[PDB]
Every structure is written in C-alpha cells, then in structure tokens.
Design an enzyme around this catalytic site. Structure first.
Site, mmCIF file in Angstrom:
data_model
loop_
_atom_site.group_PDB
_atom_site.id
_atom_site.type_symbol
_atom_site.label_atom_id
_atom_site.label_comp_id
_atom_site.label_asym_id
_atom_site.label_seq_id
_atom_site.Cartn_x
_atom_site.Cartn_y
_atom_site.Cartn_z
ATOM 1 N N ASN A 127 -9.390 5.415 11.033
ATOM 2 C CA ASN A 127 -8.629 6.401 10.260
ATOM 3 C C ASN A 127 -9.567 7.358 9.522
ATOM 4 O O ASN A 127 -9.706 8.525 9.898
ATOM 5 C CB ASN A 127 -7.663 5.700 9.286
ATOM 6 C CG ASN A 127 -8.324 4.555 8.508
ATOM 7 O OD1 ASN A 127 -8.769 3.560 9.088
ATOM 8 N ND2 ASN A 127 -8.375 4.693 7.186
ATOM 9 N N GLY A 128 -10.204 6.846 8.476
ATOM 10 C CA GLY A 128 -11.346 7.497 7.862
ATOM 11 C C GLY A 128 -12.575 6.758 8.345
ATOM 12 O O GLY A 128 -12.484 5.609 8.790
ATOM 13 N N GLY A 151 -10.406 0.680 13.571
ATOM 14 C CA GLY A 151 -9.711 1.015 14.820
ATOM 15 C C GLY A 151 -10.637 1.424 15.950
ATOM 16 O O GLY A 151 -10.543 0.898 17.063
ATOM 17 N N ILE A 152 -11.538 2.358 15.654
ATOM 18 C CA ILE A 152 -12.522 2.838 16.623
ATOM 19 C C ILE A 152 -13.602 1.786 16.885
ATOM 20 O O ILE A 152 -13.891 1.461 18.038
ATOM 21 C CB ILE A 152 -13.169 4.170 16.161
ATOM 22 C CG1 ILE A 152 -12.125 5.291 16.140
ATOM 23 C CG2 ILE A 152 -14.353 4.537 17.053
ATOM 24 C CD1 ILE A 152 -12.523 6.516 15.335
ATOM 25 N N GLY A 153 -14.177 1.251 15.809
ATOM 26 C CA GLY A 153 -15.294 0.308 15.893
ATOM 27 C C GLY A 153 -14.999 -0.986 16.627
ATOM 28 O O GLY A 153 -15.904 -1.604 17.188
ATOM 29 N N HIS A 156 -17.476 1.272 9.328
ATOM 30 C CA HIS A 156 -16.023 1.322 9.425
ATOM 31 C C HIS A 156 -15.590 2.627 10.074
ATOM 32 O O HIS A 156 -15.586 3.682 9.438
ATOM 33 C CB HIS A 156 -15.355 1.148 8.060
ATOM 34 C CG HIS A 156 -13.865 1.014 8.139
ATOM 35 N ND1 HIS A 156 -13.017 2.102 8.132
ATOM 36 C CD2 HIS A 156 -13.072 -0.077 8.247
ATOM 37 C CE1 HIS A 156 -11.767 1.685 8.226
ATOM 38 N NE2 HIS A 156 -11.774 0.366 8.293
ATOM 39 N N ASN A 170 0.830 -1.201 0.000
ATOM 40 C CA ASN A 170 0.000 0.000 0.000
ATOM 41 C C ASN A 170 0.868 1.256 0.000
ATOM 42 O O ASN A 170 1.463 1.612 1.019
ATOM 43 C CB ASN A 170 -0.967 -0.003 1.193
ATOM 44 C CG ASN A 170 -1.760 1.296 1.322
ATOM 45 O OD1 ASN A 170 -2.005 1.998 0.339
ATOM 46 N ND2 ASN A 170 -2.166 1.615 2.543
ATOM 47 N N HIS A 217 -13.195 2.583 1.427
ATOM 48 C CA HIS A 217 -13.171 1.464 2.381
ATOM 49 C C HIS A 217 -13.840 0.199 1.827
ATOM 50 O O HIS A 217 -14.254 -0.681 2.589
ATOM 51 C CB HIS A 217 -13.794 1.859 3.731
ATOM 52 C CG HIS A 217 -12.936 2.762 4.559
ATOM 53 N ND1 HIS A 217 -13.369 3.989 5.012
ATOM 54 C CD2 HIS A 217 -11.672 2.616 5.022
ATOM 55 C CE1 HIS A 217 -12.408 4.560 5.718
ATOM 56 N NE2 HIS A 217 -11.367 3.747 5.738
ATOM 57 N N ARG A 241 -10.992 15.146 9.316
ATOM 58 C CA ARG A 241 -11.913 15.459 8.223
ATOM 59 C C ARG A 241 -13.294 15.864 8.734
ATOM 60 O O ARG A 241 -13.831 15.248 9.657
ATOM 61 C CB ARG A 241 -12.019 14.284 7.250
ATOM 62 C CG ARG A 241 -10.830 14.155 6.314
ATOM 63 C CD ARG A 241 -10.760 12.768 5.703
ATOM 64 N NE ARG A 241 -9.720 12.661 4.683
ATOM 65 C CZ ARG A 241 -9.266 11.513 4.185
ATOM 66 N NH1 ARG A 241 -9.752 10.351 4.614
ATOM 67 N NH2 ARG A 241 -8.319 11.527 3.255
ATOM 68 N N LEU A 282 -9.001 9.458 19.431
ATOM 69 C CA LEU A 282 -10.180 9.273 20.273
ATOM 70 C C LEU A 282 -9.831 8.928 21.725
ATOM 71 O O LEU A 282 -10.537 9.347 22.648
ATOM 72 C CB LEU A 282 -11.097 8.199 19.683
ATOM 73 C CG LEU A 282 -12.598 8.503 19.563
ATOM 74 C CD1 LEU A 282 -13.329 7.279 19.050
ATOM 75 C CD2 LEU A 282 -13.230 8.978 20.866
HETATM 76 N N1 LIG Z 1 -8.871 1.432 22.683
HETATM 77 C C1 LIG Z 1 -9.323 2.429 21.881
HETATM 78 N N2 LIG Z 1 -10.363 3.213 22.261
HETATM 79 C C2 LIG Z 1 -10.827 4.208 21.477
HETATM 80 N N3 LIG Z 1 -10.308 4.502 20.268
HETATM 81 C C3 LIG Z 1 -9.262 3.795 19.759
HETATM 82 C C4 LIG Z 1 -8.698 2.691 20.558
HETATM 83 N N4 LIG Z 1 -7.691 2.170 19.833
HETATM 84 C C5 LIG Z 1 -7.614 2.873 18.673
HETATM 85 N N5 LIG Z 1 -8.549 3.842 18.629
HETATM 86 C C6 LIG Z 1 -8.770 4.812 17.523
HETATM 87 O O1 LIG Z 1 -8.682 4.188 16.240
HETATM 88 C C7 LIG Z 1 -8.169 5.127 15.291
HETATM 89 C C8 LIG Z 1 -7.236 4.431 14.311
HETATM 90 O O2 LIG Z 1 -8.024 3.838 13.282
HETATM 91 P P1 LIG Z 1 -7.433 2.683 12.329
HETATM 92 O O3 LIG Z 1 -6.496 3.422 11.403
HETATM 93 O O4 LIG Z 1 -8.655 2.106 11.656
HETATM 94 O O5 LIG Z 1 -6.743 1.726 13.270
HETATM 95 C C9 LIG Z 1 -7.453 6.217 16.074
HETATM 96 O O6 LIG Z 1 -7.984 7.492 15.700
HETATM 97 C C10 LIG Z 1 -7.727 5.917 17.537
HETATM 98 O O7 LIG Z 1 -8.233 7.065 18.226
#
Ligand SMILES: Nc1ncnc2c1ncn2[C@@H]1O[C@H](COP(=O)(O)O)[C@@H](O)[C@H]1O
Ligand SMILES: Nc1ncnc2c1ncn2[C@@H]1O[C@H](COP(=O)(O)O)[C@@H](O)[C@H]1O
Lengths: 394, 394
Positions: free
Chosen positions: B203-204, B323-325, B200, B8, B172, B233, B276
């Site tokens: 990140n986004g 990440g959040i979900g 989802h 990527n 996504h 965003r 977050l």
């Molecule tokens: N344990 C957690 N609780 C709340 N938010 C999280 C946690 N771990 C990761 N994140 C969020 O997930 C996002 C990353 O998204 P991703 O790139 O999909 O992993 C970041 O903005 C973090 O704030």
C-alpha cells in the site's frame, strides 16, 4: 607559453583563473565581487580590492582584461573556459562555444534562472573582448548524463518529464569527473572495471556513484536542493512537511524556498554558523546544537554514500573531496565510522594528515574498501577540456 | 474463549478484525466503506455488502456491533485495539486508552489531520458501545521513537522542530516491529546483537533499519510522502523541483500536494495503474513506461535499503514484507540483484515460492546477508499488545 582563462560567473560575482597550458599551474586568480550592485570591486590574489563603482558584467570582464594586459599575458590567452551551471539534456560533454551552443544554453536556462543567465553574460562579454580566441563551455551537469531513467526519473506524472523536463540532473559534475580520473591512478584501478563513491563536501555537498568510469547516481536533483544537508541548504526534505509548514505559518512557496536555501542546513539546526570550523570549535566548547548539526550532517552523508553504493556491482573506493572533505579530519572519521557496515577500517595516522599531503589514502590494510582524500581541481579540469578542444577544427 | 476487536478507522472507511485470544487467529473480518458519504455499506468477509445509507462513524460501529451480536461474540469481547496513525513524540509504546491518552492524541492530531481525527471518532464510538471493555491504542509511529536526533532532524531551522514539531516520525511501525520479532526466530539471531533491514512494500512503502531490536532509521518522514516511490505517492522529491513546477504551471501548494499523493508514483510514471500486477503484465506485453515505473520503483528501494544499512554496525538480514514484498517474485529478485554490492546471492528456487509458504528464507548459502520473506500481521501485533495490557491494573 600560452595560457587558459577560466571564467565562472555567479549571480553576484565573477571568479577567474589563468592557468599555464604547459603545466596546468595557476598563474593568476581573482574575484570581481558585488556584481550589478551600486558598488563593484575587483580583487586579484587578495591584492587589495580596486573598485569600479556600479559596474556590469561586461565592464568587470574588461577590468580583468586590463589587468590581464598590465601583466603582458593578453596576447598569450589561447583558450577561454566557461563554467556553466546547467546543461539540461542537450550537453553530455564540454564543447567549443558557437552560436548554436549559446542558443542551446538559453534553451535550458529556465532550469537554473539565477546561475545560467549570468553564465551567458560572461560568454557574451568574453566574445566581445576576445573574438579571435577559441572559447569552451564546461557544464556542471554533463557528467551525470550517463544516468539511466530509473536513476533520474522522479515519481511524478510522466508529463512533467516529457513536457517540462523535470528530472534529476545533478551537479558538481566537473569535480566528480576530475576526482574519478585521479582515483584510478591513486587506487591503481582499471577504469572499465571499477566502482567508486565520490563525496564532494564543501560549499554545496553532493555524492556521486561512478561505475566503470560513468556516473550512475548522484545525490543532488533537478536543483542543488536535493540530497545532502549543506551549509545553508536543507538537503532531503519531506514535501508533506513543507506543505504542512505552509499551512501552519502561512508562508508562500517563495518564502519556503528562501528558508531552504539560505536559512537552513548547518546554519538552520545550530542557529550559529554555516561554517564548519566554527561549529567544530563550538562543539569542542560543549555546544549541543553545533554537535547535532554536525552529527546530522555526518549521518546524511553516510546514508547517501551507502545508498549510492547500490548502483555499483562492486565497491572499490570512497573518495573525499571539496573544502570539507579535504580538510576536516573529524568529518571524514565520523562518516567512515558510520560506514562500518561496509567493512571499512580507517588509518587515523593517515587521516590526521593535513591537505598539504595532497592525494592520500586514509584507510588501513584490512579494509574491504579503500578510503582516500583527493583534492579537487575544477580549474584544471576545465583547462584540460579546453586544451583537448584546442586541437580541433571548428 | 475471549476475543479481541481490532479497529482501523480511515478517513473514508472502517476496517475491523476479530481475533481469538487463545490462538491469535482471525475469526471475523470486514470493512465499512463509503464513510460519511450519502451511501455507506458494510461487508463482512466479502459476504455481500449491506447498506445503511448516509451513516456516520458511530452508526457504522453500531452495525458491526450488531453483527458481532448476531454471532454471539459481543459478550466475548475482552479487549478492543485501535490503530492510530500518528503518535507524535508523546507515545513510545502501546497504551491503555484513558481520558489522558485521548487528550494527548488530539494534541498530536494536527500532524496527521486526515487520518488521526478519524481514529478518535472510532475511539469515541467504541467507548460508547463497549464501556466495560478495556481499550488499547497502538500507534503507527511509536516504534520509530528510538531514532536519534541525527536520524530524525531535518536540515530546517531548529525553530520548526522545537515550536511546531517538524521532524521525521516514520510509519508502518507496527509492521516493522512485528516483522523484526519474527526475523530473530527465523534467522536465529540474538536480538541484543543484530542488524536488520525491513522492506515493507505494498500500500505504502517504507524501509526500516533495526539495530539490536531498536528502530534506528526509517524511510518515511513527518508524512508518508518521504522515502520510497509508491503506488500513487511520489516518494523522495526535490523541493526545488516542486517550487519550479509551482512557477511554471501556476499551481498552488495544495494542487501539488494532490498530485504527489494521488496522481504520482507508479501511476504517475506509467500513466496506467498503481497496481503492480497490472504493470508486471504490461511490461510482459512490451509496455516501456510500465517497465520504467517498475525499474524506478526497484531502484529507489535498493537505494534506501543500502542507505539504511549505514545505521547498522553489521548487516545480518534483509526482510521483505507487505502486499508487494510477500507476493512479487520479480520485485524481490530485481531489488536483491540491484544489491549485489552487499554480497547477496539469491536462491531462485526459494524466491519462486508463493506466499503460502509463509516465513521463508530466499537467499542462497554463499550469501553474506540472509534474505527472507516474512508475512506481516498487524492485526496479530495489535492483539498481542492488547493481551499484554489486559493483564495490567489501570
Ligand atoms: N501476486 C502479486 N504480484 C505483485 N504484486 C502484488 C501481488 N499481490 C498484491 N500485489 C500488490 O500489493 C499491493 C497491496 O499492498 P498491501 O496493501 O500491503 O496488500 C498492491 O499494490 C498490489 O499491486
Ligand atoms: N580545516 C577545515 N576544517 C573543517 N572545515 C573546513 C576547513 N577548511 C574549510 N572548511 C569548510 O569548507 C567549506 C568551503 O567549501 P569549498 O567551497 O568547497 O572550499 C566551508 O564551509 C568550511 O567550513
């Protein structure tokens, strides 16, 4: 028999109605079109246009007052209602117009430069011609002031909200408020324990979620450009896409603002008309782009109706209103059939009925949510506020 | 034991993973950060950054290939998967990279100038270093190509769609596709008769409605700026409001595009962080603007989840991913509690469980709609497409 003079001053016209206080019935209605231009005319009930030639807001209101005098109802004018486009954060309800109010209207006028300054010109004129008459301002945004920050904040830097006041205000507030009240009677609902979705479809198109008598979400934003796709308005549009068009065609932000307001929407996709009656007939004759324009129109309404339903604890009713919502048998059905997920079943015998049948329920019995058509009356709602404020010491 | 090299290429980095064909397990992962700059370094599994100093895309991929050789798996690379940001209308599925495909990718590259050209640089490099290896392109937009015109057309003049290709594409796609497949197994659903909402969040942030295995609506637009409010965003933003800011602050369309992408969202409202975990802790310590940022974030997700539900005949599942979900116990509950209208009941014992519990159902028994958490695996989905295309005569 006292009367209420309702005035709506647009940028290019002045719409007026004279309602009888006793019954809230329309006695006289007219439009002074071609305002500020080289030629201005005044039509009343469609009773042949009478020109004034190069007339301003004060002169046009004086012509209406002269026609008000010719029918002996000038001395019968007890109240004057003014439709105001934008009330900012300052106005949560309709008020009696004083020097303070005018100043506050001019304060929030930058938020709607086209419409709001025209409203003030109408206020100044009616003050000059009817100074011993109580005058009331009704705001098209005030009903949506009950929205919580999560519902009105944009994902922009906080500074734009705190310094410049960039937030969701929403419009069609008077209509959404009127239709809400009527829905509690028609659906037999307790106001303090209810969840409604009002779909105002017509000139502009907006959705409102009404939880326990209060507006909790609305589709239009800071400007009437956000939300549903409309006749000539685009509705929800990706800013990245708008920024991409600006680079690829070499257009200004003003150029795109022109396109989004006047050249887009139903007119944009079909390339035929902003009028729905024309597009319905065109699709009936096998016009693909007229079908797409209508199908997209339907889709975005369904998306926002279901979307706004999230701001409710329970969904009791979906109410259709406005020019389109009251008359279009097709649009109502297509939207409801698009909302099968919510467990709606439509009565097509009831949905066939024309607007003459007034406030009517259009959903069948097994339906989880009651669907209904309630004709909006923005003139009556302005009068009702005026009558209430007419019993007040100022 | 043959392996798949997944690449990527971003505008500023190159993320890679080496998955074992037999088990789809990650054997090696790393990131070459600071790309095209005066200083470029390569970290593998967080195993101490090794610099190359002023290195390009070809040199960085050669460094990864050298580290691929140091662990004796260079001759074991059977397939190379390329993550492509934008596939336009030309790509509906993952394909084997040929001269034709490259040309077609360059054709639709104007739609994502930042990300898409970087992807081609990665394709050119991997071609140079692994010419006897089959190479596959997986598009982040392709899954959403099953959308009907009503779902992807903007309310703009038809010409922008026909001539310039201005329409909803959505992103996504790989994640939404992967999570969908897993949901049919976890929820025990018949693909050909199902309605899912995939959220989802990370990140986004994007929402997708999946009707009968097909994507029917998605929250992101032509660019990833439309839809949900994100880390930096803005998400859905009134164009009238953006045009109003341009006049009142005297900023260019480029200036506002910078603001919307990098200075907005969660970071914008709170004025603290895009992360977050920081904002959750800040609200726990009584930070109001961190609470508002999260509450608004939650609100717009709920609005779009319920909104996208309209494109379904029946709502079977809501799946949280990203990440959040996958990690945020709070965000999941607040969103679900905001969706009480749909008849969801949450199991808080199940919702408390950390991501280590993998694919898990988080809704209670009386719930009308099954709520679940499914960890997304975009690397595995790219590998699965590559393995399938590895059995094909080209
Ligand atoms: N344990 C957690 N609780 C709340 N938010 C999280 C946690 N771990 C990761 N994140 C969020 O997930 C996002 C990353 O998204 P991703 O790139 O999909 O992993 C970041 O903005 C973090 O704030
Ligand atoms: N019988 C009808 N069927 C479909 N659309 C209608 C009908 N009558 C009026 N309209 C639409 O209503 C809109 C006017 O909205 P309004 O300003 O709310 O009356 C116009 O765009 C018309 O296309």
């Amino acid at each position: 028999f006292p009367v209420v003079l309702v005035i709506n001053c647009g940028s290019s016209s002045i719409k007026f109605s004279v309602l009888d206080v006793a019954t809230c019935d329309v006695l006289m209605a007219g439009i002074a079109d071609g305002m500020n231009t080289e030629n201005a005319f005044l039509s009343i009930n469609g009773d042949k246009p009478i020109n004034l030639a190069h007339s301003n807001y004060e002169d046009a209101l004086k012509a209406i007052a002269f026609e008000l005098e010719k029918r002996d109802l000038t001395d019968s004018v007890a109240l004057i209602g003014h439709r105001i486009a934008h009330g900012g954060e300052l106005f949560t309800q309709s008020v009696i117009i004083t020097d303070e109010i005018i100043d506050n209207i001019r304060r929030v006028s930058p938020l709607a430069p086209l419409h709001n300054y025209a409203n003030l010109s109408g206020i100044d004129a009616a003050r000059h011609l009817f100074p011993a008459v109580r005058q009331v301002a009704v705001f098209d945004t005030s009903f949506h002031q009950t929205l919580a920050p999560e519902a009105y904040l944009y994902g922009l830097p906080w500074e734009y909200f705190s310094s410049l006041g960039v937030r969701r205000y929403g419009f069609h507030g008077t209509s959404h408020r009127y239709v809400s009240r009527r829905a509690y009677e028609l659906l037999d609902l307790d106001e303090k324990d209810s969840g409604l979705i009002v779909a105002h479809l017509g000139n502009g198109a907006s959705i409102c979620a009404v939880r326990n008598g209060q507006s909790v979400d609305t589709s239009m934003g800071m400007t009437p450009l956000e939300g549903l796709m409309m006749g000539t308005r685009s509705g929800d549009v990706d800013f990245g896409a708008m920024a991409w068009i600006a680079k690829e065609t070499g257009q200004t932000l003003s150029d795109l603002e022109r396109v989004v307001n006047k050249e887009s929407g139903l007119l944009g996709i079909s390339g035929l008309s902003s009028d729905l009656r024309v597009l319905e007939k065109a699709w009936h004759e096998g016009h693909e782009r007229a079908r797409l324009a209508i199908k997209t129109f339907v889709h975005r309404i369904a998306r926002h109706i279901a979307g706004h339903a999230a701001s409710l604890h329970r969904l009791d009713g979906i109410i259709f209103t406005g020019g389109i919502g009251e008359n279009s048998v097709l649009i109502r059905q297509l939207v409801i059939e698009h909302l099968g997920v919510l467990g709606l079943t439509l009565d097509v015998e009831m949905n066939k009925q024309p607007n003459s049948h007034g406030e009517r329920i259009i959903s069948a019995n097994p339906s989880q949510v009651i669907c209904a058509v309630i004709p909006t009356n923005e003139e009556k709602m302005i009068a009702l506020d005026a009558i209430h404020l007419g019993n007040v010491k100022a």
